[model samples]
Target chain A: DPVWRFDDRDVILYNIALGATTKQLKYVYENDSDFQVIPTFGHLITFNSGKSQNSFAKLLRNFNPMLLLHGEHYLKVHSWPPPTEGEIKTTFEPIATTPKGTNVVIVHGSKSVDNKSGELIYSNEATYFIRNCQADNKVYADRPAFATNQFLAPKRAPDYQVDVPVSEDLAALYRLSGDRNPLHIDPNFAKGAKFPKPILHGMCTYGLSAKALIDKFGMFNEIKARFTGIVFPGETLRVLAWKESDDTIVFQTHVVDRGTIAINNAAIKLVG
Target chain B: PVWRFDDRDVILYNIALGATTKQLKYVYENDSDFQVIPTFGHLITFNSGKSQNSFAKLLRNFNPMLLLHGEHYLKVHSWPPPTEGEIKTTFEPIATTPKGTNVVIVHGSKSVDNKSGELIYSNEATYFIRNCQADNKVYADRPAFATNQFLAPKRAPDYQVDVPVSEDLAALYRLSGDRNPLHIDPNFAKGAKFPKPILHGMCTYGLSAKALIDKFGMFNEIKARFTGIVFPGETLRVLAWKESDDTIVFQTHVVDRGTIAINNAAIKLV
Candidate 1:
């Protein structure tokens, strides 16, 4: 009955969230190891946002806002490599609360790396912030109480690379996360400009670099990073690394092929 | 119809230089109109020694002492908006070198911004440098020069907020000019085992941390890392891991439904 109600157009609208059920996820994982990362709610919202700001704005408005238009919203999306079956993926997430209502949403997705089956290798995420109008007359009701868990900062090491690669295929895969700017592609467009070829998406490179660290290191603790520059496509990235201490691993990803350091000042903190 | 000669990939292993073309000049001028600056390459080269290094290493250990490596190799391409198809883009000359050569290059793309056609967008350019002279010294063999130059830094970094494009991001990015065949024309993606057309890689990258700029106000100044690749139609969330005043880590995820998009993300402010 539920399946019947979702027609082709319905599939498009419903699938806008881009999330796979546990059953579907298992199918992809069993059929393809590439679909390792599970989808989240944030991806759905961000994809919806990418589809149309008016649609996303309407959706967010339904959720309620504390401020009329002053609250800050931060959203980001990440995707694991997609499966071979040709299925679309997505997710949804709430932006952080600012004593007011939720402020934004993020989206994400993943794609294959080396033309391999079941190797859905890379994943990425995006974020968004929605504000309100002063006429809404919304004010901070009260500050939420803090918890001990919030106060405890785990001690760990930072083990990761700074500079990362944005493969041609990987760059194409990232577009599913919602930015379809010509600057990323269009050699003719690039030729029209100064670039020799199309440049890679800065965020795609960011996600790829993060994937390298996650694949090497486990995700048990909170991590941090900084983006200092951009990495162009067709570049062989040289990610530099150094362990400042047992708890800190500092790194940087340089596009030796592009001869440019796309990212700068990268570090990772591992949890005990 | 002619007799074939070279059997291999027909590698053109040499450096070529030319004056900045008309298209290059136009891109720069357009950037100026939007207050978006342009950076011109004084010297550009392609397919140098480093490009052949990997294969050369596997073939033999041949080190040429007299061969110099030039640092500045530039390549530029453009994908104009669909509305302005087949139109010629041009550039302007900023400097004339003593070598009796002038440089020109495209500096921006014509894409509608958040406010639609009201605003134009242009990107900053950072050039790479390398220098090597033909010297007969032993240790000075394969001379190389490498330097990073920031051509133009706009007063404010280009920011893309919650602007939406299309329902199918993969299909839309393809329109932008990325024809990897993986994102578009799903049939071709069959070999890769994608369920449908995957999104463009750059689109995923662009969407990441877009909110950070609007939320934190100082996004351009912060350092962050992104992990993983994003497929089409997945729930996503961006985790902003603040390391310090100048440093913040960013990680993206498809949480409410499935797997973690990326794991380790680190950032710093410089």
Candidate 2:
């Protein structure tokens, strides 16, 4: 029997929080919202076909390892509910697609709830991207994997940023979730690793960034973001929130201090 | 300092999981809400109230040979509203009270939060017990000094092996707040005069006890007296169970060689 295999190489892309020197991460953190970085991680994606199991299964293949690295993440919210009850017909493309990253722009304020009108619920435009990681395509040939077959369609991009204070205490926190790999903790252990100081666990940073977005922008339930890169401690991140339409938005997050775009091309659908 | 103190006689009274037999029955019957034990340890009292601290201080002053061993723990929990004012608390005596001179072993557990209402928070507490002193008049003069020794026989652990440690056992366990140079940093270990990194012996014992208590039922109030040195990499088989309404007992074994590593492990539920 031939099994369908979905390759993610095509979906992985780079995105900045904002345009030029500005990024989304910088805006989200500094924005006038009750958003707090509560030490968490997340993934954001926009599907071309709002429902595709093949694309979802591919997403699962990538999500398992990340899940293993960061145990117990409580999802705060979702911008829009899965499309089963009605159709989300957009006159324009909902995702921004570019080599460096994507910029999804929305034209008008669109409402989706069956009855609740004028109530702002659902993300209008989102920009999400996947990164090229060495471990992104390895097959555990014989080992059991996290159950696959859960991706939605049109192939939505997944974007995530880890939010946490880059500090020594973070080194200890990661230890609670995994083995004592001193490469991230003991200064002496870093000697052989060629690091001047212990490096924060990449997953910890990713988790914290996602946590910030969830706590600030979404009520602990409707949030999602994908991990794309490793962020060291002491890096400054800004989240950018834009009014694409009355009820629609196009938001992104990035690390300004390290000069890295932590998350790119993010989209969310909100529900009241 | 005239006393030589050793943890060899100490016992980890609590195990990580719940009762093995009870668990078996639960598995067969499929019961869910059954309580399981989570953390366990012993608390030795040295009161500053009137004379205990002074007496312990006086004993340490006289005998340099006497050693003090201690472990610190922070337990976090959630409550309905939360606490605002400092909540003052104390540990009640486990052993029978003696006549004439009233003796009480005092200890305190403070909530980490200082808000008003039932809120969830963590608190820090430490446990320390000293070895018997020969030169000190107070320790030497105390009339009824009975040492209760509990040991876990080698060949047998009370519960079946459930949660076994991974090969990277010591490294994984060190995360539980035990950063002793001997357990993590190899360079620090070499400087400490060890051939290689040695796991924190106390951690092994503490973890084993934690497994037992967690398996059974996290004690609303509990205590365990340490008695032995558990070497690194050695598998400790925790033998434990409830003795009464507010009492539990435990023993341990070095699984490979079947050596009794601990004995006389008992806990008085508060």
Candidate 3:
């Protein structure tokens, strides 16, 4: 309905939340000649498009916000070198709906465009699995190949891997950007939701992977991943990457301390 | 302009000021007496200025990006501002001094709780604008608290606590509304003549105040001069001298650089 505005500060903060280090001036410094936001910054509009951007309220009944989970996400940047500061206008539409037993899986796609130029900046397809919600199964439209790809990981040893430590208060810091769901920072809210404590935001894990990928293979314009497990704050994230070709890569993220997979069926389509 | 915040903003502000999980009173909303650091008062000035053209009235050649928070003095009429409420704030030109091309302007702001017309916070945000212009003029009287001169005694501090700032401190602290690039961008900082990005003067101020509060309980009034700049990842040595039962004069030092960041500072308690 409106613009999801951002400046270099928003870019810098998102990068920092995704584990951008001080040495990475381009991501951390607004005035750096190399200053630019990682393309994933475009995905923020999915949640921040507008407070009224949520169509789920219109589509489901008895939907428990606490029971909602980010099942999968796919991001595509139509432009190279995303804008560091500007207003983004986004439009959202339902892509498909799936009824899996007691859970309702819905896929909605958002298109973020440059407000002034009207050029498409990025597109995001966010899939959410809501338990005990009701929605008729329907294939609204054919999805993009990248979003539909299984991206099976190579059985061979990974070509690149890095273990990144998540700060104990990372979620607390991360929440400032946009997604303010208490599930990421509130204990009682999390416990009543059937979790022991607040869990890290799935977008944060996705963004973190984006940073690592960009750092390794330079910037990529397309990325897709499925949330497979919960990641707690203050744990180590082990990123395992397999370069499939010169332009494509498959990766997975594991919570090293728990030996649990956080992301799977993920792939990044790179750009020079 | 008006500023509104709730438990989430409070919690984030606390955490940005170095509050940790164990500091439930500050970081946890459901905890008893979940209070924000008194330094949180200064934020309203920046938040209020967001809608207003903060630097428009300043001198010529004044770039807000190059402005340094030369010094700051803040007082809360009420301790631990309402965790969730709206505050209306108004700004005024206090005084402007010109040291050749460098300009130091004292910008005053008063915030009142919307529910009660009573004043909630007052501040003298002393901005040191580099390579700028202004005539020497006193638009208003500087409050006594803002002009307090707290010279540390020769003896060792009565209370000394060293707090180490995290490397990503600015990234976290900027979320609290002071989004100036000088605190987050190295190239911008270097252009400002600093080797790297520096921490917000308000952040160090808040950190020092929080450390003191941890030791001296709550304080209602705080004033400090930014004698030096602090980079993230440096250690802050908060030194305090008990001037009286109700007054604790203090200073903050950068341990590694042997620099005194804040001096002529004191906190007043009941």
Best by lDDT: 3
lDDT of 1 by residue, A9-112 (tens): 22221222222222332222222333333222122233224433333243344443221221111122222222222333322222222223434332212221
What's the C-alpha lDDT at position B64 in model 3?
A: 70
**lDDT score of residue A22 within candidate 2:** 15
Model 2, range B1-270, lDDT digits (tens) per residue?
A: 011111111110111121232232211112233222223222122111332233333222233222323222323344221111222223322222222232222223333222343322222222233343323122121111113343334544445443343333344333222334455454566786666565454555456555655556444332334445444545667677555675556765667556655455544343
Residue-level lDDT of model 3, residues A3-108, one tens digit each, is 7777876787788878887677677766578988877778777666344245655677667877888899999988887888888887877788888888899888
Q: How well does model 2 score by local distance difference test?
A: 0.34
The worst-scoring run of ten residues by lDDT in candidate 1 chain A lies at: A1-10
TM-score order of candidates, top first:
3, 2, 1
> In model 3 chain B, where is the ten-residue run with the lowest total lDDT?
B49-58
Candidate 3 segments whose C-alpha is farther than 4 A from its true place: A49-54, B1-13, B21-36, B43-71, B78-107, B113-118, B125-144, B151-158, B171-197, B242-245
lDDT of 2 by residue, A3-115 (tens): 11111111111111111011222222212132222211112212222232133223232322111222111132233322112223222221112222221111111122223
Model 1 stretches astray by more than 4 angstroms: A1-28, A31-35, A38-48, A51-166, A188-196, A220-224, A242-249, A265-272, B1-270
Give the per-residue lDDT of model 3 (tens digit) for B190-209: 99788998988888989998
lDDT of all predictions: 0.33, 0.34, 0.83
lDDT of 2 at A195: 61
